[PDB]
């Protein structure tokens, strides 16, 4: 292996106004969207489950 | 921009605001629950149903008032808002982790609401003692949702504790020693240390209850060689420190309020105040068994716990007399905040004194699990903790919002609340001495008068809570912008104006070492 930290330092210090969690590139965007979708979707699903468990199925 | 600011925040002020909002909402829920309790006891007979629905209400009332109202407001709200400003720090040490401590609360609250929605709820008492809380006497998801709620609230507070301790130790100006930080900052750090040490024990204990309920372990089940009393020790080892966690930030705010409205530049006996809070924090870890005087412990163990418990009155006494000594010779400003602080000093003292009565294991035999205990803790919590929160809220509202409240309306609010809480809880001493048990949906006929008067007092308090919402509305509706504040030389949090800008102390304060 070779030391490429300098390249990474350049990339992450590039003045493009992007927040650190998206400054790596397009992949950050994708991973973020996947994460948030699973979180919000899963939360909606948990709400539905609560609605189901709240009522007796005799 | 709205989402980035309010959902992705890394700002101590905004995060403190979120906490204040959450705690205010929680307070409405907890008040409603307390009204249901007092409605049920307002006249002899059954109103809602048996002890199950009643105790599901009692249990939730406690969890909401403690975990969702008091702690979030004092520590997350006032703590986040004021701590960085009082030490001239640009923000908290871990600004992102700070945001997670907040966001764990809504899910935690949702689990608590879910537990009361499913099955027959968790009617176990906030202490959640097995076997009643076990899988046979409380089968179904309710108790499990309650345990998970506590786990989330626990992680939130532990991370919050790590953040506060680190910020307070590491981010003061280079020249400022720990003995140069305001008393509120000291109160928050000590509270954070108690949280860091106590919550993990609670977490261990409730995890064991969880496994006993779902994985066939038998930590508290005698059939497997377990012991229900083990749970009590684990719970109360966290439980007592918890009550000091609920009052310490209150003591800190009271010191600031009393000093401020006495026109003083400093509280009387600063080092004695630091000593007192540290002593209280320490003693608070070696007295837990006073919540177990009737479980059948050896007499020597009971003599020790009686003795150790009473010692806390000494450091607490130093604080009380120091607050009085701060008023001494002051140019007293009779503002609404001052009123709340004066009520706190007297009412907390009364509650603390009945605590000393309860410390005696001999007497506690007869007072335990009776309304005398309920009277004791409502004086220190519903009058102590709550008055400190109200005082701090009216005092700092102009700083947080940039607007002033109507002082006359605020004084009317204080008067109503004062009558309400005293009418609600004072008669409960009588009910306790005469033998009325805790967690009862109905009582023998002889207890009718005092229960009737107590329930009427609770309605007076409801009137005060409704008025407070109106008062906050009126302030935001009229928009009277703050101009100047007195005593900024000894109250750094006000020095950046009202409200301070999003980023404060970008250029740190200058403090000579000499």
């Amino acid at each position: 292996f070779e030391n490429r930290v300098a390249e990474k330092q350049k990339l992450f210090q590039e003045d493009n106004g992007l927040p650190v969690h998206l400054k790596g590139g397009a992949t950050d965007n994708i991973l973020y969207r996947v994460t948030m979708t699973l979180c919000l979707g899963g939360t909606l699903y948990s709400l539905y489950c609560l609605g189901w468990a709240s009522f007796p199925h005799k | 921009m709205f989402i980035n600011r309010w959902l992705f925040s890394t700002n101590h002020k905004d995060i403190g605001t979120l906490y204040l909002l959450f705690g205010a909402w929680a307070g409405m829920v907890g008040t409603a629950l307390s009204l249901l309790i007092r409605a049920e006891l307002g006249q002899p007979g059954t109103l809602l149903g048996d002890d199950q629905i009643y105790n599901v209400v009692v249990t939730a009332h406690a969890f909401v008032m403690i975990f969702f109202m008091v702690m979030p407001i004092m520590i997350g709200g006032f703590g986040n808002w004021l701590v960085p400003l009082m030490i001239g720090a640009p923000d908290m040490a871990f600004p992102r982790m700070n945001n997670m401590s907040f966001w764990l609360l809504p899910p935690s609250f949702l689990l608590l609401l879910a537990s009361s929605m499913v099955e027959a709820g968790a009617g176990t008492g906030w202490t959640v003692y097995p076997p009643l809380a076990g899988n046979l006497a409380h089968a179904g998801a309710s108790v499990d949702l309650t345990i998970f709620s506590l786990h989330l609230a626990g992680v939130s507070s532990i991370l919050g504790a790590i953040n506060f301790i680190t910020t307070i130790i590491n981010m003061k100006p280079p020249a400022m020693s720990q003995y140069q930080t305001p008393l509120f900052v000291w109160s928050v750090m000590i509270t954070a240390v108690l949280l860091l040490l106590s919550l993990p024990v609670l977490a261990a204990g409730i995890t064991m209850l969880l496994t006993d309920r779902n994985l066939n372990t038998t930590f508290f089940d005698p059939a497997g060689g377990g012991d229900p009393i083990l749970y009590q020790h684990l719970f109360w080892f966290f439980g007592h420190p918890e009550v000091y966690i609920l009052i310490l930030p209150g003591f800190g705010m009271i010191s600031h309020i009393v000093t401020y409205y006495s026109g003083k530049k400093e509280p009387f006996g600063y080092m004695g105040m630091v000593w007192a809070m540290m002593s209280i924090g320490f003693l608070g870890f070696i007295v837990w068994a006073h919540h177990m005087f009737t479980v059948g412990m050896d007499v020597d163990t009971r003599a020790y716990f009686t003795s150790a418990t009473m010692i806390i009155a000494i450091p607490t006494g130093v604080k009380v007399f120091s607050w009085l000594a701060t008023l001494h010779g002051g140019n007293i400003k009779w503002s609404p905040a001052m009123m709340w602080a004066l009520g706190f000093i007297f009412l907390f003292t009364v509650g603390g004194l009945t605590g000393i009565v309860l410390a005696n294991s001999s007497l506690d035999i007869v007072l335990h699990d009776t309304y005398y205990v309920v009277a004791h803790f409502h004086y220190v919590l519903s009058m102590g903790a709550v008055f400190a929160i109200m005082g701090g809220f009216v005092h700092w509202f102009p700083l947080f919002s940039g607007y002033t409240l109507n002082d006359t309306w605020a004084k009317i609010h204080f008067a109503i609340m004062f009558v309400g809480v005293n009418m609600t809880f004072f008669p409960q001493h009588f009910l306790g001495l005469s033998g009325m048990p805790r967690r009862y949906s109905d009582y023998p006929d002889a207890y009718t008068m005092w229960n009737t008067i107590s329930s009427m007092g609770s309605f007076i308090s409801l009137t005060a809570v409704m008025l407070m919402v109106f008062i906050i509305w009126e302030a935001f509706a009229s928009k009277r912008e703050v101009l100047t504040v007195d005593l900024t030389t000894t109250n750094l949090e006000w020095l950046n104006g009202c409200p301070p800008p999003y980023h404060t102390f970008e250029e740190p304060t200058y403090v000579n070492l000499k």
Partner: protein
């Protein structure tokens, strides 16, 4: 421009995704324990992993790549890690308290003795002793790794760290095997309860600790650490020693004294 040395962190979505993942995992456990379904739990575990991955990735970006970790910031992180470890110690203390409470006053249901009637404890001189030498040995190799890094020796740092990780994995495999071989289970009264919950949470910490060390190994491979700035490695090592010390207490209390 700020004229203080502290880190003003960019607004981040991870605190929220992390909190939501906690809701999904607890909701998930409830669904599994009571409504026989692992769907919620699976989603929770996934978003949790994603949150941690991205959050820590960003911390690396902020420090190694952007230079936000000034001495003041690093000092704070040191306090943070020590405090976290303290809370973990207290968590285990609750389990030791449960162990001693049960073992020191065996109830009649157990036969009034410890270990309970019908319980045949593992021999502490067999795999449990091996596990002990494995963790103590990894404590020595990680110290060699630390000194190599400070002395600017890349090859030996990687070598020592690899050995440390192999040892942690070895312990994990040994424990997994011991769990399978054990004649007693978690449902075997308070003996099985205390044994499996305490060693189980410890095993979980060993897995977390090993993962932390693996992260360090790859950050080292990528030249992230300088001979003087490598807090991630220091934290991983402090955490590793903690895991080591908890084992020593478990070994002496549960495996040896409690047999």
């Amino acid at each position: 421009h700020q004229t203080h040395a502290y880190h003003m962190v960019n607004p981040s979505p991870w605190p929220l995704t992390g909190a939501l993942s906690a809701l999904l995992m607890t909701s998930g456990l409830t669904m599994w324990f009571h409504f026989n379904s692992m769907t919620l739990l699976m989603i929770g575990l996934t978003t949790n992993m994603l949150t941690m991955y991205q959050w820590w990735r960003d911390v690396i970006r902020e420090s190694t790549f952007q230079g936000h970790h000034t001495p003041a910031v690093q000092k704070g992180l040191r306090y943070g890690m020590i405090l976290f470890i303290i809370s973990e110690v207290l968590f285990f203390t609750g389990f030791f308290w449960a162990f001693y409470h049960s073992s020191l006053a065996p109830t009649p249901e157990l036969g009034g003795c410890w270990p309970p009637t019908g319980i045949h404890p593992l021999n502490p001189l067999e795999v449990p002793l091996l596990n002990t030498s494995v963790l103590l040995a990894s404590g020595v190799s990680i110290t060699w790794a630390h000194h190599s890094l400070m002395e600017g020796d890349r090859k030996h740092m990687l070598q020592a760290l690899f050995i440390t990780i192999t040892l942690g994995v070895y312990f994990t495999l040994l424990q997994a095997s011991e769990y399978y071989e054990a004649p007693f289970t978690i449902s075997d009264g308070v003996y099985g309860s205390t044994f499996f919950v305490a060693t189980g949470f410890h095993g979980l910490h060993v897995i977390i600790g090993s993962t932390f060390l693996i992260v360090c190994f790859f950050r080292q491979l990528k030249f992230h650490f300088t001979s003087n700035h490598h807090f991630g490695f220091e934290a991983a090592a402090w955490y590793w020693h903690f895991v080591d010390v908890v084992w020593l207490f478990l070994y002496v209390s549960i495996y040896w004294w409690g047999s």
